[PDB]
Amino acid sequence: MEMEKEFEQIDKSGSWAAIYQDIRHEASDFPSRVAKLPKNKNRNRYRDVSPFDHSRIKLHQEDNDYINASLIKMEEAQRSYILTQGPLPNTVGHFWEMVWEQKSRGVVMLNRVMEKGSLKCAQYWPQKEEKEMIFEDTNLKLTLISEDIKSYYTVRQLELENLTTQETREILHFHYTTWPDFGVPESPASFLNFLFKVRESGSLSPEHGPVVVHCSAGIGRSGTFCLADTCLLLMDKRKDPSSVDIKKVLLEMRKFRMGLIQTADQLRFSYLAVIEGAKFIMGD
């Protein structure tokens, strides 16, 4: 059912809460036993947000291989995403180890370090060229190369160096800076512009490892980013773009990480972004 019509029908009937709860009821439940081991309590920002064992990213070390991060693999769209929490003071080194090991080109950040007067994630990247960061636990060096500040987002060029082998790579940091402290944006225009800048970079393409995407918990804003991308790609690929069912794509993605899309307002915003983005995808 053409999603724009399904949209006006849910809006006129005011049933966003009822649709959202049906998704929560049908969603997959898989074990997260590694996440709940006592040695990992300080590796988790939230007690109720864990990666499933079957889809979790493993760090390449014999000691403790655990990070709060999941591989979302979309078979028909031919896209992969890593979704992760905002790094903690004791997981900043693990975060950059995962970027290195998975061969990612891009990091997508959808939150500010401080929101609502509290810390939502660690200051995990350098703010001045001349003041580089060293992570001694994972033997990595990170340098700020350049920064381009726009009204809705910032793009940064970083150098990550594996101090063990002296190999270096360029990482792009895409930072969406204007998501409001409460609710969702009124228009999806600046979010869609941001998604098209990430795509243009090559960060989402098969010649690199998966893009790393985060917010505070790595399920809400992060969920919106990957749901919109995948839905617009399927609308480009299929003979009938009106066959794309956003609720079915979201349940497929929830097989790989729990809780993706945290509120009925984030679900409505996801429909709005796909509907509006399609008026470029279909030829404009």
Ligand SMILES: NNC(=S)NCCc1ccc(Cl)cc1
């Ligand atoms: N416009 N001229 C440039 S960018 N020269 C090279 C500087 C550089 C670039 C990328 C990385 Cl990862 C590290 C260092």
